[PDB]
Amino acid sequence: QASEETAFVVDEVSSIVKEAIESAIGGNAYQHSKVNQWTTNVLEQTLSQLTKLGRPFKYIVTCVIMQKGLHSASSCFWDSSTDGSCTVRWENKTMYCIVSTFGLSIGRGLSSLSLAKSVSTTNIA
Amino acid sequence: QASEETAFVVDEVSSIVKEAIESAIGGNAYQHSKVNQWTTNVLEQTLSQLTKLGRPFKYIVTCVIMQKNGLHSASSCFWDSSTDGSCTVRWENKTMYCIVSTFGLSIRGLSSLSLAKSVSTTNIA
Amino acid sequence: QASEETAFVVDEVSSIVKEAIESAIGGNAYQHSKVNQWTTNVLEQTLSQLTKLGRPFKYIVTCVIMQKNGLHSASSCFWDSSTDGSCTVRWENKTMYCIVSTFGLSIRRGLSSLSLAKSVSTTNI
């Protein structure tokens, strides 16, 4: 007896994202010539695995890679009852990888939406 | 003779973002102590002005500020290609960069959704 | 004294296409960050104008933008050769190419009335 999952399950998303970063860049030393290939690789596995969850969400996924200052923050106008985000901050000796995931339920109008400030923030000195 | 705008219109979004960036950090020299309030200010005005447009959209808005003292970012989306969209503005002065990404997702299920790859790419050497 | 235009009129489609490309990207130097919005813009105006003709046709429209500093493409169709058609416009400036392929498919005996047309939109740079 099962049902379609309508919630944004953060730990599930996180697991998928961490696994996509390891697969892509884990064990690599930072290489400038590779970075674009790498970000593409993190994004494609992540979205592939996310979509396979078969959950009623649109997704925005952002991947940042930086060699070893960065200040980022994200805010939303969304449904706080249905929508969610997950942020993964990964590093090794030579680089940082930050992947931000935003899920917006495909399940009135503007008055049902609210501002959420700094849902994803990243400060690297 | 007028109707609610059902489409993400990039130039309009771009103008608002540029205005928010100028207002928040324009004419300033990079200062570490200020970046957090700067970033908060860019996001607040952008989302305030976006909501005032009265369009049937949820918004995700990301702001990155970096001292000119390497950044590589890319975004990918699972969304409705006939109604959803994104806008990226890359702003600079003598001492810092400000990159603001905006994603607008309109309020058959998954079948209607489509994968958009590398929609908000920024590479700064 | 008039009647609905049931034919695919190449010169009329071509005029529309050239005007959409100019409006979208004419007078610009190639810019990497701009191509996506450019592409989207060529297609919108093209389809907006096409549909305004009020002709009984489905349209497929494809836009290619490539920087001038090799491309080979060709298209083939299984369609009604009595009623269907295509138009290709190859535009250039000092720094880029913009190729736009348009296919109009008239909205019988089923498949037995359809025909195989080869190399209808070949492009070789």
UniProtKB/Swiss-Prot annotation, chains B, C:
InterPro entries, sorted: Tctex-1-like, Tctex-1-like_sf
Keyword annotations: Acetylation, Cell cycle, Cell division, Cytoplasm, Cytoskeleton, Dynein, Golgi apparatus, Microtubule, Mitosis, Motor protein, Neurogenesis, Phosphoprotein, Transport
Entry's Gene Ontology BP terms: cell division; establishment of mitotic spindle orientation; negative regulation of ERK1 and ERK2 cascade; negative regulation of neurogenesis; nervous system development; positive regulation of neuron projection development; regulation of G protein-coupled receptor signaling pathway
Keyword Cytoplasm: yes
PTM (free text): Phosphorylated by BMPR2. The phosphorylation status is proposed to regulate the association with the cytoplasmic dynein complex and may have role in cytoplasmic dynein cargo release.
Subunit structure comment from the entry: Homodimer. The cytoplasmic dynein 1 complex consists of two catalytic heavy chains (HCs) and a number of non-catalytic subunits presented by intermediate chains (ICs), light intermediate chains (LICs) and light chains (LCs); the composition seems to vary in respect to the IC, LIC and LC composition. The heavy chain homodimer serves as a scaffold for the probable homodimeric assembly of the respective non-catalytic subunits. The ICs and LICs bind directly to the HC dimer and the LCs assemble on the IC dimer. DYNLT1 and DYNLT3 compete for association with dynein IC (DYNC1I1 or DYNC1I2).
Protein name: Dynein light chain Tctex-type 1
